[PDB]
Amino acid sequence: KLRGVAPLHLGKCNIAGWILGNPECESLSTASSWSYIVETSSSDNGTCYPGDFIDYEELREQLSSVSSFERFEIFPKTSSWPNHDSNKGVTAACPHAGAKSFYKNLIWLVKKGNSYPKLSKSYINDKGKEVLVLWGIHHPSTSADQQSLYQNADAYVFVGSSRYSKKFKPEIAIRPKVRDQEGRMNYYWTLVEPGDKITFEATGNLVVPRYAFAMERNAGSGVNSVIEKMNTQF
């Protein structure tokens, strides 16, 4: 009957949608820890900008045994992005009541004034914690859409640290319009151990992190005197 009693049941988003910064979000426990998650699946809604969440089931586990949890501002939207325009990054996928907003934890980045200089950025864990950063990568529909946004024809997106490394390229093509979006937000995550710096190196197509997260874990995840020691608990 009961395998149950599990902490943090989502009311609104789903793991993906919520931990992403979808605007449908904002419920339930400003911060915490828990045994494992629960989801009203928003599937037909999900993550407002369409695309693929890679290593989703690797992570869904990775967010189970969590003890420490803190969302920190990894780099401000503000002072992090001097050479490219920061708020053009809104789209009609994710409106905040009235106007069309974007995801919370992410900056969707675009050329300021006909320019996209090479984007260089890093981050360094002073924690004894394991910091988890999420970003995304956008492949416009059309070469005009590419150029309207990022200005850089051949645009590569590298990454940083050690545990994880990779390199991405955008695909400019027309998918079926979902929320009038013929493009794609692909989403991703990594885990920065207390010691390593995750680097981001971009000529474009990169949707930057702003808030990040911090956590921890364990294996097994989702006559009178003698009496004076009681029994046990916790």
Binding site: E26, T30, F72, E73, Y211
Partner: protein, 203 residues
């Protein structure tokens, strides 16, 4: 820019609880907060992360709230609290504060304890000014100046105030004058009182 702002500005007595609030424009909580500012010196930290007393802060001070709504509380009020109090550091965003809230305490003194001083040896070269200190009185007062009198109000921008740690106290007020006229100069403090007078020039 993510506004977080405190209520009113309001008074109290040494005896009992002071009560302050801060409304985030949205949810928030790595930092240096404030909690305090004396009327003219550097801001200190009473409560940090909204529940947590900055170690070494007199216990009377206490933090509270939920995301978007927050409260700071000093239970017995002492002469020092006073100050000005600014809920600070939206902790992650452009990092904001607000004005703060007032907080003076209760005394009731009617006794400004007036002191005249006339112009001086040194003020000759330039020009003459007379100065009245009305001190350690509660709460805030009219300094009625007299050389002679009316046919208009009296002019010459003057007066000053502070508030306080220890009571409310001093005002200090000076009559901007050129030479001129009659030898009789009286600052007279009008307050809740029978109006205690001080007068002029003989010596």
């Amino acid at each position: 820019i993510q506004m977080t702002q405190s209520p009113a500005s309001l008074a109290v007595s040494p005896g009992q609880r002071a009560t302050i609030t801060c409304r985030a424009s949205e949810s928030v909580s790595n930092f240096i907060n404030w909690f305090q500012q004396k009327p003219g010196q550097p801001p200190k930290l009473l409560i940090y992360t909204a529940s947590n007393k900055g170690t070494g802060v007199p216990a009377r001070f206490s933090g509270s709230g939920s995301g978007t709504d927050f409260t700071l509380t000093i239970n017995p009020v002492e002469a020092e609290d006073t100050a000005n109090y600014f809920c600070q550091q939206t902790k992650e965003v452009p990092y904001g504060t607000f004005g703060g809230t007032k907080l003076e305490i209760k005394r009731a003194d009617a006794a400004p304890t007036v002191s005249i001083f006339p112009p001086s040896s040194e003020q000759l070269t330039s020009g003459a000014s007379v100065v009245c200190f009305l001190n350690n009185f509660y709460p805030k007062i009219n300094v009625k100046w007299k050389i002679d009198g009316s046919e208009r109000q009296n002019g010459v921008l003057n007066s000053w105030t502070d508030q306080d740690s220890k009571d409310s106290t001093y005002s200090m007020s000076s009559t901007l004058t050129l030479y001129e006229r009659h030898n009789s100069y009286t600052c007279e403090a009008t307050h809740k009182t029978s109006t205690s007078p001080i007068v002029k020039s003989f010596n």
